[PDB]
């Protein structure tokens, strides 16, 4: 009745870090939405 | 001459417009607390500009005409349905929260643009900061899932990592039973169903996380219901304190130029509010998206650019 | 071509190979670049002085100056990289992958 | 950064490229390269983040090494002939070192590794500048000394560049990596005709620059850096997606689009010199580039992907900043095939 | 360099089976060593001993592949009494592919190798006969 | 499992719309009866009336540019000439051998 | 069995399109799978420079 | 020749400027008028050709193809007007634009006095078809089909271009007239063998050959009705036209090199005819029938005799019309049923008698019933093959038998028997569908009166 259009599952294929994931590359994480990564004062004791 | 790199190059510097009175201030309180009246009094007394709390159709008031559009064409959510069945099967709660946070982000961008362009201060209700507490309550009451709060955290980080926190945060503290009494006295049938657990959760999420986290970069003025009645003392406290612990003293002319270029062009302000992470509460099908976009296009003054709509009454189209 | 020029080219090639080895210490990459520059300066000076190319005496000093400027830039970059990680280790730069 | 500082740095980059182009002394060409590299870094690090700094330091390392080997090649050429003019390179050992230096400056294989990394690290405008303007000087130097290059090494590097770009573009979901691999493949096509006809090289450079400008500007307009983010573009500006699909078909070499003009002519030229196998291999390899362009087009405009609720608000706003040369770039990159004989103007 | 090319090409096709096999084995060993070096540079698997074992395996396979191809092509050319025929090169190349598949222990890989390097050897023989140039000099 | 079992907010699949229910004499062209009727009329007039008839008559009466009758008359007169002159109808050689210069073998 | 499934649907599909797809996928995976360590790329560049100096002269 | 090209170009501005509810009427009327204009090209000569200018020329091989291409557009619009009812005006105008662009490219391709221009237009026809298949398609596999329909073609066509330019470096001209007048024999060499292959496989892939026919069932099934019509009727004939144009320079090497393709076609016709017998899809069955007919056309072209060429031209025209009609009938069934399966809806003759008559006529004309032009082409090719070798008659007769079998199987499965009980949405056939069937079928029975109009230049 209606023309097929991509669903969520069809879209999830294009959301990986790389195309055609493998065992070695399965652990790769896609870069953050903005290209900013988490970043993850000295003391002195002048004695006698 | 629309503001840009050339305007900054020639004459336009926003540091000379600061007259120690801008002092962006947000006013925060529980549901049906007297935060709005206090904020309005502060704005009137200090000569600043008041911003009414962002609603479902706040964005509709700033584009085209001020008349709000249809619910399905703008927001696709309602607070009344959230109050009636907060555990709705269609995920209306998180859709409501995400739309509200995006509207708050747009309002914050507008306020920052006004402050940077005119120098006049701005007073706000709940901002992007304090927008999380409701989410937390909606998480703890079982209204939304953990994926919802994860997506909210991602969007909130990726958006709020680019703005300046408010100079002073004003908090009004009111016991939960008094708030319930005010809810009963209001008369709106939808708000009578708010359970004491939900209000308690919001009030607890306020004190537990908000206050300590912004006491390290902003100046906090906690007030009770009785002492918030008089705006004289609040304005006196505002004028007496001096801000030197926030990021604002570290800003200069180039940082202000970057922030002013950021606050304008709202399309990039809202760019990360639609990141391609598919949560069933917010994702929309292709057919529905096409139909709703087509309906939005058929609106009177939305087919073309604002100055190129013949049905609205714009003339000299062929020569603009 | 005398043996001195061959030995200078050999030193330049050894410095390039050490740059391409990349054991650690991006500072060592900068040092290999500077050694390559030193070999180039020595060879150019020897060649120009041998042939009595009077005007070409402008050539070495210019090169030197430019290279030093380059070095400065690199140093700055390295600092910023270290300013993120706390060390100038090469393997810390693995965020971008082909 | 300060807009005046940015303008000064951009003018410094352009002046370095022009100094490389108009000077007849090897030292001045090297100085122009040094000036361009010196002024390029802050442009790459306009947006401060660790990714941009890492991309800039990788670019600095690669370009410094390339300049250093360029200077060594100049020194060896001077040693074996007391000549400073840019002409036939005389020595063959200094002509092989002059080729690898220019190859790393261009990004040809096997020195292609830095291009995807640097393009992904930097933003879209920096990527546009890096992939468009940074190719004029090395290609000009190569064209001047084209008759001195050994055809074996240059053709091997060009074929390797085409293969590497075609294969590496298949595995990418990021748009910047796709553009970098496309640039590698187009450079491989560009340098495969240098030993035979530099006019074809310059024509391919012009067509590639126009197509890349149109593509990068379209990506900037629809501010998406991934396939899924680009998939949401149809819900706001479908005409942008349609123009993007037409442009992508153009870069795939499909006739009667503009991108078919260079390849064709190059093949034609290489059939004049009794070379048959290499053009056939190049076309069969460019089929891969067309494949991943078609996959991007599938995800972009030919299908409607699911959207998000908040997108409705984006429907109420218009782009404050608009790019004047985008329509001209699209038209030039799509509909100039009937104007092919104009290449006799020695573009 | 091209020393191996000259050594392999100078020998007549219809004589000196052992010399042709030796030249082909040397070429295969060099190619396998180059592939091993590239693999080691791009991917250091675990250690020095594992790396040298990998290089030895690749070099033996390629030298082995080359040895099988040379012996088969030369023998086919001599027994068929029809030199300069690409069919002999096809047979030799596909026998080498069969040996490669046997080393890899895969029927599909063996058949694919047989087909795809028999065709390659036939194409090289045709190019040698008709003088096709892979890297054409600038004529015009 | 608090998931709504709904992957995404989607419109329901619409049912097919019948052109006959809202408008008999529907002609299957358009949902607007006047535009429908005019579409049918122009289709019938320019397909069956103009092209199918006038084009068929035009092709049927095309002039003899293929030179069929001309070739027949030429053959008639040529055979009439050769039979009267006693010539052996069509010759075996399409060209006169006198003007063909063979290469002498001398082998 | 033979005309429809064995040849048309399986072997004719296996020979031209599927083999090409598999080979291209494998080569793309091999080429693109670089961890981003400049040490390996620099060693490969050194090997390539040595090969060019020892092979193209 | 511009008297045909310029109106086709003006069809675009007219469509865009047309009212939101008057696009179909204007497009159909002006397309029919353009077909009437293009009808004038049928007046050919027994001499060389109709050389209009340096860029375009006409021939009695190009004229019937041009007439069919101009005639197909109104039928395509009439067929597409149904399923695009719920579609926005801009995208309907885009669909009509794609159809007009395809027609313009085909019209310029069929004249193509020069071979490089012919290649450029012959590959330019690819883009609109790919867009139509991958955009206005129903199933999720359409994208895959598009990919196939693309790459197969290019896999054959990219070498051809190289060969083409190589010829221009040796001969000095790729003009068809100079190429014909200055043709020289090909020495039996490996280089000439590979040049022959490069020149031949580009057109063999699009016919398609039996080995390279995989893309066709996918492309035909997943494409919309207009896409299926244009693929089956005209786009398959580009390979045959190119082969007949390019085989002049391939002699005498054609005699040796024709054997593998002749064997492949002679066995693949049987293979595809047998495949048609066991098929659960109407569109797939029609596609395989098209493959069989084009394999026969390939055999005819490879035989390289005057009767072969005449039968080939007649068969291409007849097959185009017949396949377009069959696809239209299948789409009319699908629009009511929405399943596209033969065994699902049955006994339609009881409910739709006139459509059953149309089905019967389509099946009869696909069955090669004399004196239809289908039978004329089939018989000419069969006689030429018998002259080529007396043993081909066995395979040809087997192909005729299986063709009749699967044609009547298709007719009986869908029209005869008992109707499906649970199906109740089978409405009476509209005037548009019946007019489409009549406009498809009448030209065939009119052309059988004047066969020489479609017999080509060797008549
Ligand atoms: C032929 C080969 C062609 C090669 C391709 C050319 C590369 C194109 C990039 C060059 C400029 C970069 C740019 O404009 O952004 C990309 C631009 C997109 O614009 P955008 O992304 O919106 O701008 C973002 C900027 O990065 C935002 O930067 P900003 O706003 O901070 O910069 C301030 C702005 C305004 O500058 C000023 O304020 C003027 C003040 C004067 C300073 C005095 C200094 C004197 C010492 O100055 C500029 O934008 C650079 C102009 C420099 C003049 C060059 C001569 O695309 C193009 O420019 C394509 C143009 C097509 C090629 C050129 C014409 C065809 C030949
Ligand atoms: C035979 C002499 C004819 C002289 C009179 C002129 C007739 C002109 C008719 C031209 C063709 C008709 C147009 C085709 C579409 C059908 C129209 C329709 O829908 O019917 C509605 C209409 C009203 O019916 P209804 O009650 O409202 O609806 C109930 C259902 O539809 C239920 O429907 P139904 O159950 O009543 O079935 C309809 C009926 C009719 O519908 C059809 O199936 C028509 C198909 C006819 C041919 C099938 C294709 C095969 C290729 C043959 C190509 C030859 C064409 C020659 C030039 C034609 C010029 C246009 O089907 C049949 O009866 C089966 C016919 C199979 C005969 C096989 C023999 C073929 C070769 C015969 C010799 C031809 C050349 C002779 C040369 C030597 C002698 C000089 O029915 C009719 O008008 C019947 C038409 C009369 C029968 C024609 C069959 C033989 C004519 C052969 C072609 C013309 C020969 C020219 C001179 C021959 C001497
Ligand atoms: C419903 C039941 C029937 C009722 C009606 C009863 C009447 C029956 C009569 C109908 C058929 C009976 C046969 C009678 C045939 C007589 C007419 C015939 O002789 O004319 C033919 C003429 O027919 C045409 O030649 C064929 C038709 C043209 C085909 C073009 C199709 C129309 C264009 C549409 C687009 C094309 C799409 C397909 C692309 C190719 C052949 O003429 P020809 O002997 O030679 O010479 C003509 C006279 N000359 C000598 C002066 C030249
Ligand atoms: C897969 C679906 C169908 C796709 C299309 C298939 C059709 C393409 C096949 C092309 C036809 C055959 C190619 C060459 C035919 C030449 C005739 C040859 O077979 O006969 C002998 C040729 O001898 C041997 O055949 C030598 C060639 C052996 C190497 C070919 C590999 C054999 C099987 C490989 C098939 C794979 C084809 C597809 C690759 C992708 C005659 O010996 P000779 O008189 O001395 O040579 C005469 C030619 N000269 C004068 C130029 C020298
Ligand atoms: C020298 C090099 C020659 C290169 C030849 C290139 C041939 C052109 C086709 C290239 C396709 C390569 C890409 C590929 O196949 O990837 C596998 C891909 C996986 O699907 P994805 O959408 O990428 O991801 C799904 C998971 N989320 O598989 C497919 O879908 C392929 C489907 C369509 C195949 C296209 C048809 C190709 C074969 C036709 C003939 C061409 C063969 C090559 C020339 C033959 C020699 C003369
Ligand atoms: C649907 C997929 C079909 C794929 C079609 C592929 C078949 C076409 C043949 C392969 C490509 C060859 C293109 C050659 C273009 C013609 C030019 C030419 O023939 O000139 C020859 C050049 O001939 C060649 O070089 C051809 C070499 C082939 C190299 C590429 C091999 C590709 C694969 C070959 C194996 C497949 C063979 C059959 C394929 C059939 C398709 C299934 C003369 O060379 P010169 O040096 O000028 O002569 C001087 C001395 N007299
Ligand atoms: N982040 C939020 N999530 C859900 N509802 C919200 C959120 N923020 C504000 N609201 C709703 O907005 C309504 C008005 O806010 P409130 O301050 O309590 O009333 P008033 O404007 O009269 O002072 C309240 O019913 C509150 O529930």
Judged by its nearest atom, the ligand closest to the C-alpha of residue H302 is: 4
Sheet of strand B122-124: strand arrangement: B49-51, B122-124, B25-29, B168-173, B219-224
Is residue E78 within 8 Å of residue E107, measured between CB atoms?
A: no
Residue B59 neighbours by CB under 8 Å, 6+ apart: B74, B103, B106, D313, D316
Residues 4-63 of C with CB under 8 A from D: 5, 9, 12, 16, 19, 26, 29, 33, 36-37, 40, 43-44, 47, 51, 53, 56, 59, 62-63
Long-range contact pairs involving D231-234 (C-beta distance under 8 Å, separation at least 24): D231/A11, D231/A14, D231/B276, D231/D299, D231/D300, D231/D305, D232/B274, D232/B276, D232/D305, D232/D307, D232/D308, D232/D311, D233/D300, D234/D300, D234/D301, D234/D304, D234/D305
Substitution target in A15, A35, A38 with the highest count of D β-carbons within 10 Å is A35
Q: In this complex, is the C-beta atom of G21 within 8 Å of any C-beta atom belonging to chain D?
A: no
Please write down the HEC assignment for all residues of chain B: CCCCHHHHHHCCCCCCCCCCCCCCEEEEECCCCCHHHHHHHHHHHHCCEEECCCCCCCHHHCCCCCCCCCCCCCCCCCHHHHHHCCCCCCCHHHHHHHHHHHHHHHHHHHHHHHHHHHCCCEEECCCCCCCHHHHHHHHHCCCCCHHHHHHHHHHHHHHHCCCCCCCEEEEEECCHHHHHHHHHHHCCHHHHHCCHHHHHHHHHHHHHHHHHHHCCCCEEEEEECCCCCCHHHHHHHHHHCCCCCCCHHHCCHHHHHHHHHHHCCHHHHCHHHHCCCCCCCCEECHHHHHHHHHHHHCCCCCCCCCCCCCCCCCCCHHHC
Resolution to 1 decimal, in Å?
Answer: 3.0
Residue H42 neighbours by CB under 8 Å, 6+ apart: F59, F62, H63, H64, H67, H453
Among D276, D283, D291, select the one facing H166 at the smallest CB separation.
D276
DSSP state of H234: I
- Indicate yes or no: CB of C97 within 8 angstroms of CB of A28: yes
Residue closest to H39 by CA, chosen among H62, H64, H7, H60: H64
- Nearest chain A residue (CA) to C97: A28
Angle at H323 between CA H132 and CA H248, to 5 degrees: 90
Judged by its nearest atom, the ligand closest to the C-alpha of residue H429 is: 2
Q: How many residues does chain G have?
A: 57
Ligand 4 contacts CB of residue H190 (under 6 A): yes
Exposure string of B74-92, with b = 16+ CB inside 10 Å and e = fewer, is bbbbeeebbeeebebeebb
CA atoms within a 13 Å half-sphere pointing along the CA-CB vector of D251? 32
- Indicate yes or no: CB of D317 within 8 angstroms of CB of B103: no
Which chains does D contact via 3+ CB–CB distances below 8 A?
A: A, B, C, E, G, H
Substitution target in A4, A5, A7, A9 with the highest count of H β-carbons within 10 Å is A4
Residues B191 and C59: their CA atoms lie apart, in Å, by 83
Given the structure tokens 């024709």, which residue do they identify?
A: H258
Q: How far is CA B125 from the centre of its chain?
A: 8
Which chains does G contact via 3+ CB–CB distances below 8 A?
A: A, C, D, E, H
**E strand or H helix that includes residue D308:** strand D307-308
Is residue D128 within 8 Å of residue D78, measured between CB atoms?
A: no
**E strand or H helix that includes residue H13:** helix H2-17
Residue G40 neighbours by CB under 8 Å, 6+ apart: E41, E42, E43, E44, G34
Q: A10 to chain H: which residues are within 8 Å by CB?
A: 140
Q: Give the DSSP letter string of F55-72.
A: IHHHHHT---TT-SHHHH
Exposure string of H300-329, with b = 16+ CB inside 10 Å and e = fewer, is bbbbbbebbbbbbbbbbbbbbbbbbbbbbb
- Indicate yes or no: CB of B254 within 8 angstroms of CB of D2: yes
Cα of H60 to ligand 2 centre, how many Å?
29
The shortest C-alpha distance from G34 to chain H (Å) reads 29
| B138 annotated as belonging to a binding site for a ligand | yes
Backbone phi, psi, residue B169, to 5°: -105, 125
Backbone phi, psi, residue B229, to 5°: -70, -40
3-state percent helix, strand, coil for chain A, nearest multiple of 5: 15, 0, 80
Substitution target in G1, G2, G4, G12 with the highest count of H β-carbons within 10 Å is G4
Is residue H140 within 8 Å of residue H48, measured between CB atoms?
A: no
Chains F and B touch (3+ CB pairs under 8 A): yes
Is residue H414 within 8 Å of residue H337, measured between CB atoms?
A: no
Residues C7 and B314: their CA atoms lie apart, in Å, by 80
Residue closest to H359 by CA, chosen among H413, H281, H320: H413
| B186 annotated as belonging to a binding site for a ligand | yes
What kind of experiment solved this structure? Answer: cryo-EM
Reported CATH class of domain C3-92: mainly alpha
Given the structure tokens 């080219």, which residue do they identify?
A: C9
Q: Give the DSSP letter string of D215-231.
A: HHHHHHHTT--BHHHHH
Q: In this complex, is the C-beta atom of D303 within 8 Å of any C-beta atom belonging to chain A?
A: yes
Structure tokens at H331: 């789409």
Structure tokens at E92: 């030799």
- Indicate yes or no: CB of A4 within 8 angstroms of CB of H338: no
**CA separation (Å) from B280 to D309, E68, H373?**
11, 61, 59
Q: C97 to chain A: which residues are within 8 Å by CB?
A: 28
**Is it true that the peptide bond before D110 is cis, omega within 30 degrees of 0?**
yes
Ligand 4 contacts CB of residue H397 (under 6 A): no
Is residue D172 within 8 Å of residue G32, measured between CB atoms?
A: yes
Neighbours of D158 (CB within 10 A): 24
Q: In this complex, is the C-beta atom of H380 within 8 Å of any C-beta atom belonging to chain A?
A: no
Cα of H195 to ligand 6 centre, how many Å?
6
Neighbours of D153 (CB within 10 A): 19
Residue closest to D83 by CA, chosen among D93, D71, D75, D95: D75
Residues D258 and D249: their CA atoms lie apart, in Å, by 9
Q: Is D112 helix (H, G, I), strand (E, B) or coil?
A: coil
Q: D195 to chain E: which residues are within 8 Å by CB?
A: 138
Q: In this complex, is the C-beta atom of E130 within 8 Å of any C-beta atom belonging to chain H?
A: yes
């Amino acid at each position: 009745a209606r023309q097929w259009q991509p669903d969520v599952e069809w879209a999830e294929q294009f959301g990986g870090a790389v195309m055609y994931p493998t065992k070695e590359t399965a652990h790769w994480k896609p870069p953050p939405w903005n290209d900013v990564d988490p970043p993850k004062n000295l003391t002195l004791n002048f004695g006698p | 001459l629309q503001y840009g790199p050339l305007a900054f190059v020639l004459g336009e510097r926003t540091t000379r417009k600061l007259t120690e009175t801008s002092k962006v201030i947000t006013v925060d309180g529980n549901i049906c607390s007297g935060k709005g009246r206090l904020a309005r009094e502060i704005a009137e007394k200090l000569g600043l500009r008041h911003f009414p709390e962002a609603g479902i159709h706040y964005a509709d008031s700033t584009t085209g005409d001020g008349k709000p559009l249809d619910v399905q064409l703008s927001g696709n959510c309602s607070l009344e349905k959230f109050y009636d069945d907060p555990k709705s099967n269609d995920g209306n709660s998180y859709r409501l929260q995400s739309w509200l946070y995006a509207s708050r982000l747009l309002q914050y961008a507008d306020a920052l643009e006004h402050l940077l362009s005119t120098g006049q201060g701005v007073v706000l209700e709940r901002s992007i900061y304090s927008d999380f507490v409701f989410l937390e309550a909606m998480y703890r009451q079982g209204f939304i899932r953990k994926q919802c709060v994860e997506h909210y955290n991602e969007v909130k980080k990726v958006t709020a990592c680019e703005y300046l926190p408010p100079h002073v945060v004003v908090y009004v503290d009111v016991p939960v039973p008094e708030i319930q009494s005010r809810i009963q006295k209001k008369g709106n049938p939808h708000e009578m169903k708010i359970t004491a657990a939900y209000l308690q959760d919001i009030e607890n999420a306020y004190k537990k996380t908000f206050l300590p986290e912004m006491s390290e970069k902003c100046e906090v003025l906690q007030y009770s219901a009785r002492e918030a009645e008089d705006a004289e003392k609040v304005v006196e406290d505002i004028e007496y304190l001096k801000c030197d612990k926030g990021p604002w003293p570290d800003q200069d002319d180039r940082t202000f130029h970057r922030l002013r270029m950021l606050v304008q062009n709202k399309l990039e302000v809202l760019n990360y509010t639609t990141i391609p992470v598919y949560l069933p509460e917010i994702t929309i099908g292709a057919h529905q998206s096409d139909r709703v976009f087509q309906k939005f296009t058929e609106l009177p003054g939305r087919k073309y650019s604002p100055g190129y709509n013949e049905d609205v009454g714009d003339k000299w189209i062929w020569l603009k | 071509m005398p043996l001195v020029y061959m030995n200078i080219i050999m030193a330049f090639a050894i410095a390039l190979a050490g740059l391409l080895m990349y054991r650690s210490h991006l500072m060592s990459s900068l040092l290999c670049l500077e050694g390559m520059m030193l070999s180039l300066f020595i060879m150019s000076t020897l060649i120009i002085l041998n042939t009595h190319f009077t005007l070409a005496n402008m050539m070495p000093i210019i090169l030197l100056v430019f290279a030093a400027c380059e070095a400065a830039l690199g140093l700055s970059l390295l600092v910023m990289v270290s300013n993120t990680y706390g060390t100038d280790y090469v393997q810390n730069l693995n965020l971008l992958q082909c | 950064m300060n807009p005046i500082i940015y303008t000064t740095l951009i003018m410094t980059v352009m002046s370095g490229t022009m100094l490389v182009m108009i000077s007849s002394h090897w030292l001045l060409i090297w100085i122009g390269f040094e000036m361009n590299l010196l002024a390029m870094i802050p442009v790459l690090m306009k947006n401060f983040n660790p990714r941009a700094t890492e991309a800039a330091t990788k670019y600095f390392l690669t370009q410094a090494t390339a300049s250093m080997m360029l200077m060594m090649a100049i020194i060896i050429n001077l040693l074996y002939s007391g000549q400073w003019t840019i002409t036939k390179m005389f020595n063959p050992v200094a002509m092989t070192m002059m080729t690898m230096a220019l190859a790393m400056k261009l990004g040809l294989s096997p020195f292609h590794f830095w291009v995807p990394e640097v393009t992904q690290g930097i933003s879209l405008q920096a990527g546009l500048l890096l992939l468009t303007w940074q190719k004029l000087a090395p290609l000009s130097v190569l064209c001047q000394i084209s008759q001195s290059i050994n055809p074996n090494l240059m053709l091997t590097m060009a074929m390797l560049s085409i293969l590497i770009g075609g294969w590496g573009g298949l595995n990418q979901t990021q748009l910047r990596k796709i553009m970098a691999y496309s640039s590698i493949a187009h450079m491989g096509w560009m340098t495969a005709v240098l030993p035979y006809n530099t006019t074809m090289t310059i024509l391919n450079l012009l067509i590639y620059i126009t197509m890349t400008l149109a593509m990068f500007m379209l990506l900037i307009h629809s501010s998406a850096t991934t396939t899924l983010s680009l998939s949401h573009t149809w819900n706001k500006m479908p005409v942008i997606t349609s123009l993007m699909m037409v442009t992508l078909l153009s870069m795939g070499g499909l006739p009667p689009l503009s991108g078919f003009m260079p390849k064709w002519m190059i093949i034609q030229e290489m059939t004049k010199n009794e070379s048959i196998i290499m053009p056939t291999l190049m076309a069969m390899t460019a089929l891969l580039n067309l494949y991943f362009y078609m996959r991007l087009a599938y995800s972009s405009s030919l299908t409607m992907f699911p959207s998000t609720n908040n997108m409705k608000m984006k429907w109420q706003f218009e782009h404050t900043k608009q790019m004047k040369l985008l329509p001209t770039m699209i038209v030039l990159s799509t509909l100039v095939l009937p104007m092919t004989p104009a290449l006799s103007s020695l573009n | 360099a091209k020393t191996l090319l000259h050594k392999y090409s100078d020998i007549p096709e219809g004589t000196e089976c052992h010399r042709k096999a030796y030249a082909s084995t040397s070429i295969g060993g060099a190619t396998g060593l180059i592939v091993s070096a590239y693999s080691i540079a791009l991917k250091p698997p675990a250690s020095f001993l594992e790396g040298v074992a990998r290089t030895g395996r690749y070099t033996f396979t390629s030298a082995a592949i080359g040895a099988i191809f040379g012996l088969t092509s030369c023998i086919s050319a001599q027994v068929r009494e029809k030199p300069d025929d690409p069919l002999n090169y096809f047979i030799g190349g596909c026998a080498g592919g069969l040996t490669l598949g046997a080393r890899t222990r895969s029927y599909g890989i063996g058949a694919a190798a047989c087909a795809y390097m028999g065709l390659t050897a036939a194409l090289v023989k045709m190019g040698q006969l008709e003088g096709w140039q892979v890297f054409a000099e600038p004529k015009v | 499992p608090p998931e709504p079992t709904i992957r995404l907010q989607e419109d329901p699949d619409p049912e097919d719309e019948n052109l006959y229910e809202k408008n008999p004499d529907s002609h299957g062209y358009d949902k607007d009866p006047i535009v429908d009727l005019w579409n049918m009329r122009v289709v019938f007039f320019f397909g069956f009336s103009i092209v199918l008839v006038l084009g068929s008559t035009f092709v049927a009466y095309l002039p003899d540019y293929r030179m069929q009758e001309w070739a027949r008359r030429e053959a008639e007169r040529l055979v009439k000439y050769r039979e009267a002159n006693g010539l052996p109808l069509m010759e075996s050689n399409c060209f006169d051998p006198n003007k063909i210069q063979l290469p002498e073998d001398e082998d | 069995k033979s005309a429809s499934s064995l040849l048309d649907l399986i072997w004719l599909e296996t020979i031209l399109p599927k083999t090409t797809s598999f080979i291209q996928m494998k080569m793309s995976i091999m080429v693109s799978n670089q961890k981003g360590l400049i040490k390996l790329y620099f060693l490969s560049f050194l090997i390539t420079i040595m090969i060019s100096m020892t092979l193209f002269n | 020749m511009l008297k045909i090209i310029i109106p086709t170009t003006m069809l675009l501005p007219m469509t865009w400027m047309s009212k939101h509810n008057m696009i179909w009427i204007n497009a159909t009327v002006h397309s029919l008028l353009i077909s009437l204009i293009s009808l004038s090209l049928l007046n050919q000569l027994g001499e060389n050709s109709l050389n209009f200018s340096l860029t375009f020329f006409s021939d009695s091989l190009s004229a019937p193809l041009l007439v069919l291409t101009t005639w197909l557009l109104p039928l395509m619009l009439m067929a597409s007007q149904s399923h695009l009812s719920k579609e926005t005006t801009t995208r309907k105008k885009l669909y009509i634009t794609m159809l007009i662009l395809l027609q313009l490219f085909l019209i310029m391709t069929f004249t193509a006095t020069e071979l490089i221009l012919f290649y450029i237009l012959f590959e330019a026809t690819l883009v609109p078809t790919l867009i139509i298949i991958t955009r206005w398609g129903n199933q999720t596999e359409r994208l895959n089909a598009g990919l196939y329909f693309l790459f197969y073609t290019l896999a054959g066509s990219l070498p051809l271009l190289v060969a083409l330019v190589y010829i221009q470096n040796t001969t000095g001209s790729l003009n068809f007239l100079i190429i014909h007048y200055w043709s020289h024999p090909l020495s039996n060499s490996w280089s000439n063998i590979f040049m022959w292959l490069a020149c031949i496989m580009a057109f063999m892939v699009k016919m398609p050959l039996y080995g390279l026919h995989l893309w066709l069932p996918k492309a035909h099934v997943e494409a919309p009705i207009a896409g299926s019509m244009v693929l089956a009727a005209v786009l398959l004939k580009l390979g045959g036209y190119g082969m007949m144009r390019i085989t002049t320079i391939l002699n005498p090497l054609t005699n040796y090199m024709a054997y593998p393709f002749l064997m492949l076609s002679m066995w693949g016709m049987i293979m595809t005819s047998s495949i048609c017998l066991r098929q659960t899809d109407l569109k797939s069955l029609i596609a395989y029938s098209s493959v069989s007919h084009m394999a026969l056309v390939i055999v005819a072209i490879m035989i390289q005799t005057p009767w072969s060429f005449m039968g080939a031209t007649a068969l291409m025209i007849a097959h185009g019309l017949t396949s377009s009609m069959l696809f239209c009938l299948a789409n009319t069934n699908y629009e009511r049923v929405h399943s596209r399966t033969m065994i699902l809806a049955r006994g339609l003759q009881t409910l739709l008698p006139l459509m059953a008559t149309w089905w019967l006529v389509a099946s009869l004309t696909n069955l090669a019933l004399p004196p239809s032009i289908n039978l004329i082409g089939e018989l000419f090719i069969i006689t030429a093959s018998f002259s080529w070798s007396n043993i081909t008659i066995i395979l040809m007769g087997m192909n005729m038998m299986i063709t009749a079998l699967y044609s009547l199987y298709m007719l009986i499965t869908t029209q005869r028997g008992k109707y499906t009980h649970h199906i109740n949405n089978i409405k009476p056939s509209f005037t548009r569908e019946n007019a489409l069937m009549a406009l498809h079928i009448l030209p065939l029975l009119l052309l059988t009166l004047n066969p020489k109009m479609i017999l080509g230049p060797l008549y």
